[PDB]
PDB file of C-alpha atoms in Angstrom:
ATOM      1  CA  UNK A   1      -5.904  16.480  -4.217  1.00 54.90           C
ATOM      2  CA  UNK A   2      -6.209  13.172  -5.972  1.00 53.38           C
ATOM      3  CA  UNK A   3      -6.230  11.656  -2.870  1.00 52.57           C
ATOM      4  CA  UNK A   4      -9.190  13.464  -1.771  1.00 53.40           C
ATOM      5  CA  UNK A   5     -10.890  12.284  -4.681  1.00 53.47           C
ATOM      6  CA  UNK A   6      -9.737   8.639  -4.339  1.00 52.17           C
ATOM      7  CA  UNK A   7     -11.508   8.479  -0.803  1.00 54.35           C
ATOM      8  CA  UNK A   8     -14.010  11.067  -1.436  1.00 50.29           C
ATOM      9  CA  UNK A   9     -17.520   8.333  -0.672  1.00 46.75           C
ATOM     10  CA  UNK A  10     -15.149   7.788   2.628  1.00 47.24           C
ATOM     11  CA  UNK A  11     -15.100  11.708   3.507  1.00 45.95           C
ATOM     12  CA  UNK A  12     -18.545  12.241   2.786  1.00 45.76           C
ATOM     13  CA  UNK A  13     -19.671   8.966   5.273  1.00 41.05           C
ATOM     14  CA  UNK A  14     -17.401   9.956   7.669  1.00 37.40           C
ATOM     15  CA  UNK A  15     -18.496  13.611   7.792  1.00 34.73           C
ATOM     16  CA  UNK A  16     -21.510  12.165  10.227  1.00 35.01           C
ATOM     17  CA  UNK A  17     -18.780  12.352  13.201  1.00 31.09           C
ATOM     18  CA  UNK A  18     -18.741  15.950  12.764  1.00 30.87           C
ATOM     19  CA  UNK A  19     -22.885  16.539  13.177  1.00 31.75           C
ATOM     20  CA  UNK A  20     -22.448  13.671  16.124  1.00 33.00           C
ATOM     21  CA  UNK A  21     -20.072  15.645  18.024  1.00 33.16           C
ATOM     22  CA  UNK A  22     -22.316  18.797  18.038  1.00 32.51           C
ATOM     23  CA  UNK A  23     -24.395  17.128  20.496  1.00 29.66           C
ATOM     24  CA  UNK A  24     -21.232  16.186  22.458  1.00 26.71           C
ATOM     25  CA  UNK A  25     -20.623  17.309  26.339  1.00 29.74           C
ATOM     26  CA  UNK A  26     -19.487  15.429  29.312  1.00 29.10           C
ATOM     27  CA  UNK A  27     -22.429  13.458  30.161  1.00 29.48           C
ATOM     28  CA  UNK A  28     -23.127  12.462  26.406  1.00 29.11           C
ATOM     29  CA  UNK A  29     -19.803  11.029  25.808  1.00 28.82           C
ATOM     30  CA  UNK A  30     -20.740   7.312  25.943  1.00 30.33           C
ATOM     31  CA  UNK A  31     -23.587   7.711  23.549  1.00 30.91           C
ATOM     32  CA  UNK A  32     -21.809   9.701  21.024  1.00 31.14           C
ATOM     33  CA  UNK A  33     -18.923   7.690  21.288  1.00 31.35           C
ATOM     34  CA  UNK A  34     -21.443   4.555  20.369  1.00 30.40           C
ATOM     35  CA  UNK A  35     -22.251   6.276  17.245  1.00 30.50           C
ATOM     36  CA  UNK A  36     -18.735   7.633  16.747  1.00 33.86           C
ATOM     37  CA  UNK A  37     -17.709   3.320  16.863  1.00 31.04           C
ATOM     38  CA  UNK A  38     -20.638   2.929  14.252  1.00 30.13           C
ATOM     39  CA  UNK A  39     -19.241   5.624  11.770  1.00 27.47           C
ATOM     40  CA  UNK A  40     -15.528   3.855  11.853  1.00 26.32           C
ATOM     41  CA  UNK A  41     -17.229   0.283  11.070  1.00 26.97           C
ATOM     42  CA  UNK A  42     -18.936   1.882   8.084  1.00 28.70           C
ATOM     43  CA  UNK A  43     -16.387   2.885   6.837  1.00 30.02           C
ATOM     44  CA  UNK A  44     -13.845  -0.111   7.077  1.00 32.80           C
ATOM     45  CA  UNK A  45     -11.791   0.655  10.201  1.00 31.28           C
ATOM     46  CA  UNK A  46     -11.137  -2.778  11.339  1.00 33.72           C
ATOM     47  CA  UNK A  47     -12.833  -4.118  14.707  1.00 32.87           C
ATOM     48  CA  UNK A  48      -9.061  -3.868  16.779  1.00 33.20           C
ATOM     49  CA  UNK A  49      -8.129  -0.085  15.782  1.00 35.47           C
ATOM     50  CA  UNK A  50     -11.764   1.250  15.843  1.00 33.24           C
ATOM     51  CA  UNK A  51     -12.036   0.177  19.639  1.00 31.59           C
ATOM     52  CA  UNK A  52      -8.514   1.587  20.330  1.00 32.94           C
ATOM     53  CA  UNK A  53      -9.483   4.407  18.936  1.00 32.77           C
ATOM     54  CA  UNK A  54     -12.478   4.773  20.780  1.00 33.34           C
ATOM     55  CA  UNK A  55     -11.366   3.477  24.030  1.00 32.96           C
ATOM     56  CA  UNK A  56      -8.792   5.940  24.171  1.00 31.63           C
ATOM     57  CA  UNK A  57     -11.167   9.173  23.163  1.00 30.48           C
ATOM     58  CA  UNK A  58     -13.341   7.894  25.717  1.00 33.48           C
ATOM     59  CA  UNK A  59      -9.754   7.807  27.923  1.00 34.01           C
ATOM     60  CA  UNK A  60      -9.227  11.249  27.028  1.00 33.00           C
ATOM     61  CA  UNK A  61     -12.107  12.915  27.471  1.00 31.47           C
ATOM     62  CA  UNK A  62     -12.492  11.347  30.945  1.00 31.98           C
ATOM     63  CA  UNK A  63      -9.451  12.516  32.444  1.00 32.41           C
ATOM     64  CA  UNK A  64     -10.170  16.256  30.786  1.00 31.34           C
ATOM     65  CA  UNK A  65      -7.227  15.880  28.417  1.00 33.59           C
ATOM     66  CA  UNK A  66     -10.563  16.826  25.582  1.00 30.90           C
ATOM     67  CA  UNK A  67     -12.621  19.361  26.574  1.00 32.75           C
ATOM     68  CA  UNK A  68     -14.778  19.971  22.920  1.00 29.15           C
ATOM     69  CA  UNK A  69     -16.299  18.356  20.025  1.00 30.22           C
ATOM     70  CA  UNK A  70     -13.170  20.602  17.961  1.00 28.82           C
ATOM     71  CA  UNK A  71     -10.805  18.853  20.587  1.00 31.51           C
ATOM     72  CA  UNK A  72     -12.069  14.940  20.200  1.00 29.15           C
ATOM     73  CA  UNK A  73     -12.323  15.170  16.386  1.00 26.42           C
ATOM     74  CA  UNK A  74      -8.598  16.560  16.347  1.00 26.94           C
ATOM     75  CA  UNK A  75      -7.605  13.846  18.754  1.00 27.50           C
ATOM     76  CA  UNK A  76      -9.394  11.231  16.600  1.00 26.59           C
ATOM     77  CA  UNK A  77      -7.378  12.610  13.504  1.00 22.94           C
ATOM     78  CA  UNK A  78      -4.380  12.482  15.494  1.00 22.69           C
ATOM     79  CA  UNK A  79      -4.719   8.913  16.869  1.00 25.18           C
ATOM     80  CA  UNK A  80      -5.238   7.703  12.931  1.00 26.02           C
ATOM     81  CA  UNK A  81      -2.238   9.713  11.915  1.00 26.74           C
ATOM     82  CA  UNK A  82       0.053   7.699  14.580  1.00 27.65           C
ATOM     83  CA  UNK A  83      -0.683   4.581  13.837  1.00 26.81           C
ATOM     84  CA  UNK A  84      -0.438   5.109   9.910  1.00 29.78           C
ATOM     85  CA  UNK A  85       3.406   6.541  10.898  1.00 29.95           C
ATOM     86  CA  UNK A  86       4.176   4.284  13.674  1.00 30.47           C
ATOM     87  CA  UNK A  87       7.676   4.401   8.655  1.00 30.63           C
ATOM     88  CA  UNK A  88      10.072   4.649   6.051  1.00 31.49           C
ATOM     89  CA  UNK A  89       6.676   5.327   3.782  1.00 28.67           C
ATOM     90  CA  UNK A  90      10.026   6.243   1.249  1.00 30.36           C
ATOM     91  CA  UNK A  91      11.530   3.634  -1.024  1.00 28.00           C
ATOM     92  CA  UNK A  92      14.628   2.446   0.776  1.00 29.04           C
ATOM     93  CA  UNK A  93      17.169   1.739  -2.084  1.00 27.99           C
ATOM     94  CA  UNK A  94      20.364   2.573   0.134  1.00 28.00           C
ATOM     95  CA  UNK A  95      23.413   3.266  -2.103  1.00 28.78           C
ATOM     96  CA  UNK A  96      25.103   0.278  -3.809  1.00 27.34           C
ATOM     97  CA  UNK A  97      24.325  -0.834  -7.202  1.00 28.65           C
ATOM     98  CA  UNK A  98      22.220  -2.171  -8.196  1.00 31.71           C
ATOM     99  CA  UNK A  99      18.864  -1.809  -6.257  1.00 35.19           C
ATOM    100  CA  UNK A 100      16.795  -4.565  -6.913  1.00 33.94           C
ATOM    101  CA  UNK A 101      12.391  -4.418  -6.166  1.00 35.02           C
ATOM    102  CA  UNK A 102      10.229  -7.505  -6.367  1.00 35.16           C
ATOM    103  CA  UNK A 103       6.809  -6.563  -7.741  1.00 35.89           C
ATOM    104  CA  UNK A 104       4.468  -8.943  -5.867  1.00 35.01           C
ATOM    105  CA  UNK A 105       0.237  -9.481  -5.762  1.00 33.78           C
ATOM    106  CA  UNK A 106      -2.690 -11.458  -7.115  1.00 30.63           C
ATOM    107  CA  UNK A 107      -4.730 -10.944 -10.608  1.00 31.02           C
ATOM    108  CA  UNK A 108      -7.067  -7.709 -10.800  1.00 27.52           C
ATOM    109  CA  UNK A 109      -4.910  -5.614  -8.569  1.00 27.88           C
ATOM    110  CA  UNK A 110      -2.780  -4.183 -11.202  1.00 32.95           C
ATOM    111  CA  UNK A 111       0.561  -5.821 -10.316  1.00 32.20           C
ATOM    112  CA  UNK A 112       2.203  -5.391 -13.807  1.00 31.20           C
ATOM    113  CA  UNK A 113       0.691  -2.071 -14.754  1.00 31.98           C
ATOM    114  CA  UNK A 114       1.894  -0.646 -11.275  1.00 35.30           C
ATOM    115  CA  UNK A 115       5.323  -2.083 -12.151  1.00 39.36           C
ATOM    116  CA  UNK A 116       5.064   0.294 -15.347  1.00 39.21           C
ATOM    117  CA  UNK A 117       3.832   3.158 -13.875  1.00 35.86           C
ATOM    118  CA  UNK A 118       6.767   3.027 -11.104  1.00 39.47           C
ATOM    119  CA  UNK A 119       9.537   3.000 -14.222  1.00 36.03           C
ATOM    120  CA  UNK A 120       8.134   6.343 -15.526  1.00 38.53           C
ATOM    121  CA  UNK A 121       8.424   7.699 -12.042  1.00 37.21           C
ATOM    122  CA  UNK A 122      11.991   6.497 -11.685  1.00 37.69           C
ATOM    123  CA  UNK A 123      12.723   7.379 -15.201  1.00 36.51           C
ATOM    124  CA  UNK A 124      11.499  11.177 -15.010  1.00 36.39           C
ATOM    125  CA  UNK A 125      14.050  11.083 -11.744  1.00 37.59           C
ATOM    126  CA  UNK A 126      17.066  10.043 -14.173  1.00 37.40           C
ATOM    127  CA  UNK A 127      17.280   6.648 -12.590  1.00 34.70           C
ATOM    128  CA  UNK A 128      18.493   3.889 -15.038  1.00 36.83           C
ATOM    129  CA  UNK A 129      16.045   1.550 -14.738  1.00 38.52           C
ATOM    130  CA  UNK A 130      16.473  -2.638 -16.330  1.00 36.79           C
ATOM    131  CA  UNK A 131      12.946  -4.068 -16.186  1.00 38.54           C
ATOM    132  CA  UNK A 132      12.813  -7.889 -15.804  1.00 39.54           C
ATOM    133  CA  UNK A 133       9.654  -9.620 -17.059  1.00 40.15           C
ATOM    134  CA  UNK A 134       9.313 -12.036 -14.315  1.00 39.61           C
ATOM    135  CA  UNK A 135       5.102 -13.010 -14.749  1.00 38.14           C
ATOM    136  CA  UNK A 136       6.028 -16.088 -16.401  1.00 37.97           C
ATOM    137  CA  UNK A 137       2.649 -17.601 -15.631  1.00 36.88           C
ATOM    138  CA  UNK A 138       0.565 -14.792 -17.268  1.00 37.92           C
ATOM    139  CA  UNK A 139       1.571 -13.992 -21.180  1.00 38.12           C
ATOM    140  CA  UNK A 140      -0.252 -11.142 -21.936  1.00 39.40           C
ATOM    141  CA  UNK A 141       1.577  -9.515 -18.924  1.00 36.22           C
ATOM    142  CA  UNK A 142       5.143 -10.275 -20.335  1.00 38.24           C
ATOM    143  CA  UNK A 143       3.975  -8.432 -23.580  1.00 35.13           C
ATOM    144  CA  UNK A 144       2.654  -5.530 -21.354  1.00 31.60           C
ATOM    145  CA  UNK A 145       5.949  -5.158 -19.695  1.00 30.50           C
ATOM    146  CA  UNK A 146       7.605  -5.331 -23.437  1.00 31.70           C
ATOM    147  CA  UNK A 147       5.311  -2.054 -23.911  1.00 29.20           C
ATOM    148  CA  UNK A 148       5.995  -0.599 -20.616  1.00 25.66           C
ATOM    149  CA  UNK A 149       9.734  -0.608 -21.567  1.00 29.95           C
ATOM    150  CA  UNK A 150       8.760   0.823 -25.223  1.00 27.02           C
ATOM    151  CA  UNK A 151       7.074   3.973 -23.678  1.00 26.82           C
ATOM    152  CA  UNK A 152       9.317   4.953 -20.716  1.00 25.94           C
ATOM    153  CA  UNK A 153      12.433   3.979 -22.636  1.00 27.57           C
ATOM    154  CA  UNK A 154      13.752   1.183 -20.418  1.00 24.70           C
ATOM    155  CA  UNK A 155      15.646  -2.017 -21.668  1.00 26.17           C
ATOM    156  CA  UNK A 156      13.606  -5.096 -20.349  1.00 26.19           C
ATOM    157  CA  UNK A 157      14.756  -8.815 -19.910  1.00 25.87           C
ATOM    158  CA  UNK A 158      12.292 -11.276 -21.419  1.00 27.38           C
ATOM    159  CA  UNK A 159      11.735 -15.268 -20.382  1.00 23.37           C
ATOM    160  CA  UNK A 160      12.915 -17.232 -23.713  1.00 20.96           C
ATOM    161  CA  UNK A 161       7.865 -21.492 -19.958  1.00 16.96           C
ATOM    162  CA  UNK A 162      10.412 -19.962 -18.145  1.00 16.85           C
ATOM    163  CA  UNK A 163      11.311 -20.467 -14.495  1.00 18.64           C
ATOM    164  CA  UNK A 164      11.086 -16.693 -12.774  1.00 19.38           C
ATOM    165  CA  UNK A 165      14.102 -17.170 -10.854  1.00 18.14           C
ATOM    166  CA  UNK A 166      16.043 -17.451 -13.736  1.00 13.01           C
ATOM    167  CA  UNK A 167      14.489 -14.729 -15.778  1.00 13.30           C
ATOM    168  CA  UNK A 168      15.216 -12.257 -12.366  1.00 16.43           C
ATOM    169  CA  UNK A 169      18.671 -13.826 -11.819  1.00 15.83           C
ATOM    170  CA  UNK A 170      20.089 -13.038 -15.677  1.00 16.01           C
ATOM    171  CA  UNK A 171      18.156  -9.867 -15.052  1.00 13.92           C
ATOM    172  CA  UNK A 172      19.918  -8.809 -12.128  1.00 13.97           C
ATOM    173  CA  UNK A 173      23.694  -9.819 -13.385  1.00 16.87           C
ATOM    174  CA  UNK A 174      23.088  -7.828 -16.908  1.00 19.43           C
ATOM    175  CA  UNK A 175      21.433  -5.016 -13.902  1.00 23.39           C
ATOM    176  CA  UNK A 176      25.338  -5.534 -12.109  1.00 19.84           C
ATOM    177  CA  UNK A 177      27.565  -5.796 -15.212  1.00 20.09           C
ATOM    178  CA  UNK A 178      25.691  -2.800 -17.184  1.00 21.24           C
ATOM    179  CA  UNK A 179      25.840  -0.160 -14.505  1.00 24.43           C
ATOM    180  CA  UNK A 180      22.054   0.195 -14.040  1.00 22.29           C
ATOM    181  CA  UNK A 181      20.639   1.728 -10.646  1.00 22.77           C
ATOM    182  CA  UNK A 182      17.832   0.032 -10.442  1.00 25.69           C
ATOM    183  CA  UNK A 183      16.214  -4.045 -11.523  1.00 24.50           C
ATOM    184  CA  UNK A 184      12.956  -3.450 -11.181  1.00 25.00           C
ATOM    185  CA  UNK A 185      11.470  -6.842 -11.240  1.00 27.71           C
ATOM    186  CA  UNK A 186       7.708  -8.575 -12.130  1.00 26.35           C
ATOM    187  CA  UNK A 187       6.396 -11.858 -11.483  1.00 27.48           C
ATOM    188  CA  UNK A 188       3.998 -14.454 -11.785  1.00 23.96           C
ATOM    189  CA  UNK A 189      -0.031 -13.414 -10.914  1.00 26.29           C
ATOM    190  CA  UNK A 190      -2.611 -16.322  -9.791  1.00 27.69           C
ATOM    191  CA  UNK A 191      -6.191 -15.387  -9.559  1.00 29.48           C
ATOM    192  CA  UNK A 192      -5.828 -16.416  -5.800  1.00 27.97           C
ATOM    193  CA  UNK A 193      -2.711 -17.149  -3.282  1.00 28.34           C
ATOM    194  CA  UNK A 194      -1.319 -20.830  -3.565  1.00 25.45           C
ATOM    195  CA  UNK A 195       1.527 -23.068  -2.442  1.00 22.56           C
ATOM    196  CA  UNK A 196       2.887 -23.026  -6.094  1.00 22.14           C
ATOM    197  CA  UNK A 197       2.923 -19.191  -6.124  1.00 21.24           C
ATOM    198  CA  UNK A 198       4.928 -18.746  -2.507  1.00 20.85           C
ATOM    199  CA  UNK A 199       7.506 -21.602  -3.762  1.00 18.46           C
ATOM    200  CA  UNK A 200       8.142 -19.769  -6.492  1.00 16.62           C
ATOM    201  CA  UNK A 201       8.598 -16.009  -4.467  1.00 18.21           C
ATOM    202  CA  UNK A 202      10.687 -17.619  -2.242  1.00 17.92           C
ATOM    203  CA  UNK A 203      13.397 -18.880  -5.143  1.00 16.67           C
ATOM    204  CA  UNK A 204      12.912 -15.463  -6.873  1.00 18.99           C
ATOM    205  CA  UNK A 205      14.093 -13.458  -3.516  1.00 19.96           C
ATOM    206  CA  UNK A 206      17.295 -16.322  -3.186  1.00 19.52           C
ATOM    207  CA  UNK A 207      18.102 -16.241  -7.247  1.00 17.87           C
ATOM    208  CA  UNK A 208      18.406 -12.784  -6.740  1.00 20.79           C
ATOM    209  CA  UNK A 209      19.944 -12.706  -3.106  1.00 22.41           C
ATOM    210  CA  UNK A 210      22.685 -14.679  -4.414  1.00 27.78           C
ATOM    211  CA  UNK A 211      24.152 -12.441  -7.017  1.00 29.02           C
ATOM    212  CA  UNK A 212      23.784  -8.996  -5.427  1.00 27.59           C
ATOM    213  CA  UNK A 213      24.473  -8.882  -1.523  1.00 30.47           C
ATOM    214  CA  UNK A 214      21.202  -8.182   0.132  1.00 30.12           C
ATOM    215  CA  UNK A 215      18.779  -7.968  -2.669  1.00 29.61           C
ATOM    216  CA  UNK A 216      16.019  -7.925  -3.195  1.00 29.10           C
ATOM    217  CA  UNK A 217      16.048  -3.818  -1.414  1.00 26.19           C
ATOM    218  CA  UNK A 218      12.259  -4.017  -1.524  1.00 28.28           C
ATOM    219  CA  UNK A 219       9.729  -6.671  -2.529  1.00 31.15           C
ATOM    220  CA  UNK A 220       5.963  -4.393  -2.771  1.00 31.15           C
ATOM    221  CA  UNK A 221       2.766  -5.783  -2.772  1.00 33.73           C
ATOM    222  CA  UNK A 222       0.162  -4.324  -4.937  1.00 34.81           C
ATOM    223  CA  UNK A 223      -3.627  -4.855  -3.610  1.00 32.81           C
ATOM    224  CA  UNK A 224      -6.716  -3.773  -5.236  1.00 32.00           C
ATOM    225  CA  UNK A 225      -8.181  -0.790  -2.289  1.00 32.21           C
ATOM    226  CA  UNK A 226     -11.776  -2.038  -3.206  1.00 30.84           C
ATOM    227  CA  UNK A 227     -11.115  -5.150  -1.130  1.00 31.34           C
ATOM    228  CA  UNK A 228     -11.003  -3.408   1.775  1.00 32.04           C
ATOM    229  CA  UNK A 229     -10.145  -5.369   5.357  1.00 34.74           C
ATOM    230  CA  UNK A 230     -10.583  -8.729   3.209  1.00 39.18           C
ATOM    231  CA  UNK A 231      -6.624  -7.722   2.230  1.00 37.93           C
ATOM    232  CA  UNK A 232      -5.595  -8.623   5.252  1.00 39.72           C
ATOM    233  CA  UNK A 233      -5.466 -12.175   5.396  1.00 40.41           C
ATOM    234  CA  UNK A 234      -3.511 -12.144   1.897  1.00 44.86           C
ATOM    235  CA  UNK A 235      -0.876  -9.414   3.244  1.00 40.82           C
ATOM    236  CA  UNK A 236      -0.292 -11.311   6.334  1.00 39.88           C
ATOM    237  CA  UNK A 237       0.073 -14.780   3.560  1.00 40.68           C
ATOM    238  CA  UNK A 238       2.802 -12.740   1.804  1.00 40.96           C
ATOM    239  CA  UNK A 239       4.132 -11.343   5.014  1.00 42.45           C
ATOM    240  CA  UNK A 240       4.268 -14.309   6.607  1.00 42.55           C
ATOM    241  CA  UNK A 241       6.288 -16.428   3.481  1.00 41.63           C
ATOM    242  CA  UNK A 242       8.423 -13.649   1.408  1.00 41.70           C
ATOM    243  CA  UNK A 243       8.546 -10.685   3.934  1.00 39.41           C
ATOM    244  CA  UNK A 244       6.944  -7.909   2.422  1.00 43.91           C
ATOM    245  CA  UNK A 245       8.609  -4.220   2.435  1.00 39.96           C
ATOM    246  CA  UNK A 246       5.837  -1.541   1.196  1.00 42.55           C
ATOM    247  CA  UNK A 247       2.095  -2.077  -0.196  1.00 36.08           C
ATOM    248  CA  UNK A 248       0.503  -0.424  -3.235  1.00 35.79           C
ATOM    249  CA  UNK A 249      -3.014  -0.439  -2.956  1.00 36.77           C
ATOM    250  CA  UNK A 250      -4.637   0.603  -6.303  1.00 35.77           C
ATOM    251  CA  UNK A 251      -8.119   0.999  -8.189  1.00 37.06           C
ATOM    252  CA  UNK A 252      -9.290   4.010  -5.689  1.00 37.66           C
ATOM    253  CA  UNK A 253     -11.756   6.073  -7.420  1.00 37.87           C
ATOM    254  CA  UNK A 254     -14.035   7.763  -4.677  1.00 37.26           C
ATOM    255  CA  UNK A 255     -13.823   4.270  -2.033  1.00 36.61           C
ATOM    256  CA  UNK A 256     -15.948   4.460   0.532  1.00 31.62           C
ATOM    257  CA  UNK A 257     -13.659   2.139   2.465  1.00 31.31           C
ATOM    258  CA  UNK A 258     -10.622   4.257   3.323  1.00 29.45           C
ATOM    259  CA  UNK A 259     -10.955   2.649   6.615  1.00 30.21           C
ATOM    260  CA  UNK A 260      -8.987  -0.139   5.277  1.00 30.80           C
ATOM    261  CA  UNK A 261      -5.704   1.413   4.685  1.00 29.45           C
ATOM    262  CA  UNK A 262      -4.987   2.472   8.473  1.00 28.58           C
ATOM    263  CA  UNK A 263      -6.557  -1.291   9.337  1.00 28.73           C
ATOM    264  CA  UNK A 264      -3.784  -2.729   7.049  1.00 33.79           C
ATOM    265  CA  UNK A 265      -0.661  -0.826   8.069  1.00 33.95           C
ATOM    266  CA  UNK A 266      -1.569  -1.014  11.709  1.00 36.24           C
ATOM    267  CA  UNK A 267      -1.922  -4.789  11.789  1.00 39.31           C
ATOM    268  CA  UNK A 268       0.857  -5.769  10.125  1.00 37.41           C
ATOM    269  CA  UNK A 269       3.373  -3.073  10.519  1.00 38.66           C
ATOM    270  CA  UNK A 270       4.103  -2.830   6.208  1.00 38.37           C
ATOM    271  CA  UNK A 271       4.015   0.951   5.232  1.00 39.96           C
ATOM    272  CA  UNK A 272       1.601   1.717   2.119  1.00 40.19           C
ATOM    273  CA  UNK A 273       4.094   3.022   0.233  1.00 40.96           C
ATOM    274  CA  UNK A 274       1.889   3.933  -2.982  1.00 42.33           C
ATOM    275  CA  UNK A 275      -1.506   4.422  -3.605  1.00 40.84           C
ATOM    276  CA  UNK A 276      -3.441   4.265  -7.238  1.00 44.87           C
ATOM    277  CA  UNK A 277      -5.977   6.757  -7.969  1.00 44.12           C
ATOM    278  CA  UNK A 278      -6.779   6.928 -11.985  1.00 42.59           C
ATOM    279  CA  UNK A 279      -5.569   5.423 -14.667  1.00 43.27           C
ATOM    280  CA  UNK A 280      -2.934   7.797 -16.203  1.00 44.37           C
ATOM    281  CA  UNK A 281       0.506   7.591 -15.723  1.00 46.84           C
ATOM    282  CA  UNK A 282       0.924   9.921 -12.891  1.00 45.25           C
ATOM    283  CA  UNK A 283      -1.845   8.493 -11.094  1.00 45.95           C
ATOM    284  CA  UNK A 284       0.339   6.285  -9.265  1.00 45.66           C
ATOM    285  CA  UNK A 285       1.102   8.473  -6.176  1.00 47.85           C
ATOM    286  CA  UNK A 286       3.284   8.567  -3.453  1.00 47.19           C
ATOM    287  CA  UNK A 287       1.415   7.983  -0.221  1.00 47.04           C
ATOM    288  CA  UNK A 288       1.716  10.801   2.419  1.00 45.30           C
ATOM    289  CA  UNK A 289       0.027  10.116   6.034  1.00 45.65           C
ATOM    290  CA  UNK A 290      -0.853  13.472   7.204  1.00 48.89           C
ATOM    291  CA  UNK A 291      -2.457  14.098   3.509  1.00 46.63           C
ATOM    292  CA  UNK A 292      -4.848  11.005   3.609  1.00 48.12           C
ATOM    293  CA  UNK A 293      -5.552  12.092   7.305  1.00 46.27           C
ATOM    294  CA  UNK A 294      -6.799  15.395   5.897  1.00 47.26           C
ATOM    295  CA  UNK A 295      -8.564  13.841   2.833  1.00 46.48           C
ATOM    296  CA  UNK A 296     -11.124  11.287   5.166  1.00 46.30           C
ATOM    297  CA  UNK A 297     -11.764  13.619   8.301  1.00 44.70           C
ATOM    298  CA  UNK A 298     -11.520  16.902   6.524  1.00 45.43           C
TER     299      UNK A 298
END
């Protein structure tokens, strides 16, 4: 519903497959599957999963597995679908107490306000929820948390600059001791990636490691969707240094670059987890597959 509306420039550009594959039949299928290439492009698919996508229509339709236009666009929903869900899309906070999440990303993708969004969510479930305010590079994000924790009636842990490890490790023993379910942790945003940034996500996931048995339970990255495929590099950066769990891609108000999304979780294997479509409250959604499927293909 929102989701059709976050994507809904996407839909509309990718609505073109659906007037190309009236003039589909046997002997057209390499033309329209040109065009068909040409449509995914537009709209963000990355170079690798628009030609296996392609390739394998044109596979398909060869062998007489797809018979009709109806057929191929189902099959092209289909092959989008499975390699969204090829996921655990859930957050995975097992059972012992308590479960700590790493809030991760760069400036202007709405790291800290996701982080506060996420604690009314877990709040309206009944989850007892310790916030740690873990930016210790950015100030005015510290005082955001400190009204984050006013409004969804969470306790918060402030740095007294600090070093985020030991913000999130006091955190994360008071979490322990107090008989909270959740630590639900920020930290520091840089306007770009940088050696001082991964040193310090790397002592935040062992500060925290150290005083609850396999914590952090998930550490989520939170991109701006407008980027589109020029996430990918970053992700993989993250990825490659911290080991990310889940993505939140935010900032989606009728993106004409949906595209990106399948392009990200394919490549790298991380499930989006949530996705950001307004700026309410609510607006931070869980992200379901099948339901995205339906809101860029129709």
């Amino acid at each position: 519903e929102k989701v059709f509306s976050g994507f809904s420039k996407t839909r509309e550009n990718l609505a073109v497959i659906d007037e190309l594959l009236l003039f589909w039949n046997l002997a057209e299928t390499d033309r329209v599957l040109d065009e068909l290439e040409e449509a995914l492009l537009v709209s963000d698919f990355g170079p690798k999963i628009t030609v296996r996508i392609v390739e394998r229509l044109r596979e398909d339709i060869m062998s007489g597995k797809l018979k009709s236009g109806s057929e191929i666009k189902d099959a092209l929903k289909e092959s989008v679908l499975e390699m969204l869900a090829k996921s655990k899309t859930e957050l995975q906070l097992g059972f012992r107490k308590p479960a700590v999440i790493m809030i991760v990303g760069v400036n202007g993708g709405g790291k800290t306000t996701s982080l506060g969004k996420l604690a009314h969510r877990l709040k309206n479930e009944g989850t007892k929820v310790l916030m740690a305010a873990g930016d210790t590079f950015r100030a005015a994000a510290s005082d955001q948390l400190e009204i984050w924790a006013e409004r969804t009636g969470c306790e918060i842990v402030v740095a007294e600059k600090a070093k985020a490890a030991t913000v999130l490790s006091k955190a994360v023993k008071r979490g322990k001791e107090e008989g909270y379910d959740v630590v639900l942790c920020d930290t520091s945003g840089r306007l770009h990636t940088n050696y001082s940034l991964m040193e310090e996500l790397i002592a935040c996931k062992k500060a925290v490691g150290k005083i609850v048995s396999g914590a952090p339970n998930e550490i989520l990255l939170v991109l701006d969707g407008n980027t589109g495929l020029n996430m990918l590099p970053q992700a993989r950066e993250f990825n490659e240094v911290v080991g990310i769990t889940g993505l939140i891609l935010t900032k989606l108000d009728g993106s004409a670059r949906g595209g990106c999304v399948v392009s990200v979780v394919e490549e790298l294997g991380i499930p989006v987890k949530f996705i950001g479509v307004g700026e309410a409250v609510e607006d931070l959604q869980p992200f379901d597959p099948e339901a995205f499927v339906n809101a860029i293909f129709s």
